[PDB]
């Protein structure tokens, strides 16, 4: 539109425009300042009056000369969606950075979108198996579910997710989305390479995963709207295509973080810790745009870089509200060398109900929880005084628990290189059997190191023989 303005201020990457026209862009409209760097996309976020909007700048603001011409693009920027977005990596603005040339599309849809209504909902209950034992026992996935991974890098945030992609998405047939906010560039390049190698993308062949990647080098403002862009691609699959979808988001602390950065500049009194006062609302919008409607089921995976593992920091706290399963992974358990490093007393799922996983499973899980909690409870006593100064009943419990802890160690398949141990995949039905036996102490009579880093119950036995030799 010939609606133009000039740049009154450039206070950080929260540029302010002065619309000299009496026509004013509306809130969440987008503006393009044409630069010798290409274009700069800004998005209107406040009207400060006197015909001066205050605009978030999606790209870097190095070199801007005040008074420079602004031209109004109008409305939320509309990304391009389609089957021709399958196997493409798109920039925040949407430009294909995987250089298969400009993505031709049918429908271009606005980045901002409203979340589906309470009327439009469908309640899932279908278990989705992972084949990861600890996951299966404690908090199994579910089709359409919103699963969440807490704990920062120090668990190797990416590594857990990669296993999920390797297992779940090779058996998923519908579309799948990886949207990586603030993802460290080399790891992203690795993922792209791996995906092409595992044929989930083929650039001459077909693709069935699509990619949005936002690198952590990208200016904070860009990082703020990477998520919203991905959600649009997801909406096209969920709704218009109707086909079932997967979704991975790594890392949504970076989404919050980006918001926290802009908040001060925006002109907001920063709430507790430093998070934006609009933290709750912003979290709300994102997490209600990934729901399982009657039009489609989208299984979503959220990765939170918990700052120093303080869950009490408000951003991790507000994530808990929008998740139906969580698998908090602890640095301590990582130090214990357990990969997967999932904390077992800090995992939960709504899918751990006894009518869902069956009473026998629930009973089995119950006993594990009690045993491990006892083991954690006696950690004080164990450290201060020996285990032979514990009760006869307790020393058995402790010995069982030490075995359970080691048993939980399953070789990782995607980290097969890093662990240096060939990976494993263990069926859920098999998992229940294996734990049942361990709880009855049937095969408890062999080294605790035999339980360490192995798959199924049968494998423990064989490795006991190996150790015996």
């Amino acid at each position: 539109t010939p609606i133009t303005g000039k740049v009154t201020a450039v206070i950080g990457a929260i540029v302010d425009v002065h619309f000299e026209q009496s026509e004013l862009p509306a809130i969440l409209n987008a503006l393009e300042i044409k630069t010798p760097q290409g274009k700069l996309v800004l998005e209107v976020a406040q009207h400060l009056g006197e015909n001066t909007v205050r605009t978030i700048a999606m790209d870097g603001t190095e070199g801007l000369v005040r008074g420079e011409k602004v031209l109004d693009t109008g409305g939320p920027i509309s990304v391009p969606v389609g089957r021709e977005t399958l196997g493409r990596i798109i920039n925040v603005i949407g430009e294909p950075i995987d250089e298969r040339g400009p993505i031709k599309s049918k429908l271009r849809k606005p980045i901002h979108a409203d979340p589906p209504s309470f009327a439009e909902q469908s309640t899932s209950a279908e278990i989705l198996e992972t084949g990861i034992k600890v996951v299966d026992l404690l908090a199994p996935y579910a089709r359409g579910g919103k699963i969440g991974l807490f704990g920062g890098a120090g668990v190797g945030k990416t590594v857990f997710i990669q296993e999920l992609i390797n297992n779940i998405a090779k058996a998923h047939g519908g579309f799948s989305v990886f949207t990586g906010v603030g993802e460290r560039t080399r790891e992203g390049n690795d993922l792209y390479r791996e995906m092409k190698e595992t044929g989930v993308i083929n650039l001459e062949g077909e693709s069935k995963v699509a990619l949005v990647f936002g690198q952590m080098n990208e200016p904070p403002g860009a990082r703020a709207r990477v998520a919203l862009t991905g959600l649009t691609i997801a909406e096209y699959f969920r709704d218009e295509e109707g086909q079932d979808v997967l979704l991975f988001i790594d890392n949504i602390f970076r989404f919050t973080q980006a918001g926290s950065e802009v908040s001060a500049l925006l002109g907001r009194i920063p709430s507790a810790v430093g998070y934006q006062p609009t933290l709750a609302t912003d979290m709300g919008l994102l997490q209600e745009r990934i729901t399982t409607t009657k039009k489609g089921s989208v299984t979503s995976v959220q990765a939170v870089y918990v700052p120093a593992d303080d869950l009490t920091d408000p951003a991790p706290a507000t994530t808990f509200a929008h998740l139906d399963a969580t698998t908090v992974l602890s640095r301590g358990i990582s130090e214990l060398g357990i990969y997967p490093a999932v904390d077992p007393l800090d995992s939960k799922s709504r899918l751990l109900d006894a009518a869902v996983v069956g009473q026998e499973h629930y009973d089995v899980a119950s006993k594990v929880q009690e045993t491990l909690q006892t083991y954690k409870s006696l950690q004080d006593i164990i450290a201060i005084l020996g285990m032979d100064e514990l009760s006869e009943q307790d020393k058995l419990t402790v010995e069982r628990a030490r075995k359970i802890q080691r048993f939980l160690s399953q070789p990782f398949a995607v980290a097969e290189v890093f662990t240096g141990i060939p990976g494993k995949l263990v069926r859920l039905k098999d998992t229940v059997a294996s734990f049942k036996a361990v709880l009855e102490g049937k095969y408890d009579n062999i080294p605790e190191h035999a339980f360490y880093m192995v798959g199924g119950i049968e494998d423990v036995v064989a490795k006991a023989e190996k150790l015996a030799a």
């Binding site: 201020a9 070199g63 950075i97 390049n189 390479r193 700052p307 240096g420």
Partner: protein, 499 residues
């Protein structure tokens, strides 16, 4: 004499240039000045005051522009005339910076004449995209066996060295530079590293010792030193890593392999904290500003192993974080950890308990290390990380584990620990490291009583070279052990061990 030449240079300066615009300074102090005018200014321009100090415009506000002084307040004065340099903040880059100490501005604090530099390049430059990257494969050999097996590091690889204050933190990096002296005294450009040592927040005295140390080891001729001492102004310190990385990127964008060691980014955090507070931007978590994550991430991601199409570029990154009495939970450390791939946590307890280098193996990881690792050092390194995490477990419960199996591991483990130790500032050759690891892994080091392990190492190496350096040359080129080489080494190792 030299004075006559300088006077000739003085005769050679005399401008007549028109000033596009000036400003006049308003309220000034807090290392920011508020200037009236500068309406045609570009953002992040460099302005030069009439005190000769230069500053970077940060906040371009309606009717005023707020410079940030890269330089002392004392020099700048109220109502002083600010002249536009007219250029975004750039620093000289080129081939001539090798063997030159420079400060952040690029002034030659070495004083080996005005710097020879091909170009200048903007202080902040966007990191290369996904498509520009290519997975690492070439090694960087640090000369510390642990930091070559337990943590293998490669070309263009982001990695982290974290640990406790002045445990000779610097020495760990110095040894890498020293080890790669013979690779850099090579004629193969690919195996040449041009290493940049960024000294931020360090005593000018300490830096002078470092320079002298480097020139004692005559390593200066392949290396640049950038300096932003503690005395140097906090905004200069803030821009100091970014500027250093630009110089590094010129090498990277020559395709040439390089390394840049940023000592200490923890001091960059304190500097940015100071700057932020003095910009009256609200304090973030742990009172470190909210954009501190962004600051580190933008810096770190400018190091890359560029794809063969885009040049085959490499610029390895080792950034040195000063933990306050350990405890990796701490906002600044965690923020760094998340960016970096791999950590080299160092343990104070082990340092005190005479393990130099004090490489904690519980908290040292390399998250992309094995790709870099040479096949020789994959074969000989038979899950030594696992083995010593069996030693770690064994000694956990030793004080119980009286099982002969545990004891055998303990005997191996303790003895293996002895092999890890290396007298700092004397790094071992890669070729030489291959047999040592063979010996210990293949358990021929139980054949050596713990006390005499140090003797064994030197003697074993002398024996091997004298017996047949043919083997060592072969693994030097092959970088793999054939069944025959492996057997020859097993046989030879048995021969020395016995003797």
């Amino acid at each position: 004499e030299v004075s006559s030449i300088l006077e000739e240079r003085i005769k050679g300066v005399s401008d007549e240039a028109n000033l596009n615009e000036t400003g006049r300074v308003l309220a000034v102090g807090d290392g920011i000045a508020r200037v009236f005018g500068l309406n045609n200014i570009q953002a992040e321009e460099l302005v030069e005051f009439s005190s000769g100090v230069k500053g970077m415009a940060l906040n371009l506000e309606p009717g005023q522009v707020g410079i940030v002084l890269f330089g002392s307040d004392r020099l700048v004065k109220e109502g002083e005339l600010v002249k536009r340099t007219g250029n975004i903040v750039d620093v000289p880059v080129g081939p001539g910076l090798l063997g030159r100490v420079v400060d952040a501005l690029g002034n030659p604090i070495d004083g080996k004449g005005p710097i020879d530099a091909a170009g200048r390049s903007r202080a902040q430059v966007k990191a290369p995209g996904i498509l520009p990257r290519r997975s690492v494969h070439e090694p960087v050999q640090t000369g510390l066996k642990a930091v070559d097996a337990l943590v293998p590091i490669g070309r263009g690889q982001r990695e982290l060295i974290i640990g406790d204050r002045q445990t000779g933190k610097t020495a760990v990096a110095l040894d890498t530079i020293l080890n790669q002296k013979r690779w850099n005294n090579g004629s193969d450009e690919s195996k040449k590293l041009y290493c940049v040592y960024v000294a931020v927040g360090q005593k000018r005295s300490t830096v002078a010792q470092l320079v002298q140390t480097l020139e004692q080891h005559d390593a200066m001729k392949y290396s640049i030193i950038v300096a932003a001492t503690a005395s140097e102004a906090a905004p200069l310190q803030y821009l100091a890593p970014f500027t250093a990385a630009s110089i590094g990127e010129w090498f990277r964008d020559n395709g040439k392999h390089a390394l840049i060691v940023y000592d200490d980014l923890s001091k960059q955090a304190v500097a940015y904290r100071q700057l932020s507070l003095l910009l009256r931007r609200p304090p973030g978590r742990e009172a470190y500003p909210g954009d501190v994550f962004y600051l580190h991430s933008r810096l770190l991601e400018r190091a890359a192993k560029l794809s063969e199409k885009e040049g085959s570029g490499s610029l390895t990154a080792l950034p040195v974080i000063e933990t306050q009495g350990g405890d990796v939970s701490a906002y600044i450390p965690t923020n760094v950890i998340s960016i970096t791939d791999g950590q080299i946590f160092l343990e104070a307890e082990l340092f005190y308990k005479g393990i130099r280098p004090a490489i904690n193996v519980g908290l040292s990881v390399s998250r992309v290390g094995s790709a870099a690792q040479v096949k020789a050092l994959k074969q000989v390194a038979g899950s030594l990380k696992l083995f010593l995490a069996q030693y770690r477990e064994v000694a956990a419960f030793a004080q119980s584990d009286l099982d002969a199996s545990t004891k055998q591991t303990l005997v191996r483990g303790e003895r293996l620990t002895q092999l890890l130790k290396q007298n700092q500032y004397s790094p071992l050759a890669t070729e030489e490291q291959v047999p040592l690891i063979y010996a210990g892994v293949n358990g021929h080091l139980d054949g050596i009583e713990l006390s005499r392990i140090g003797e064994f190492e030197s003697s074993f190496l002398s024996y091997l070279k004298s017996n047949h350096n043919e083997l060592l040359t072969e693994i030097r080129e092959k970088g793999e052990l054939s069944k025959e080489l492996l057997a020859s080494l097993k046989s030879a190792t048995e021969s020395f061990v016995a003797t």
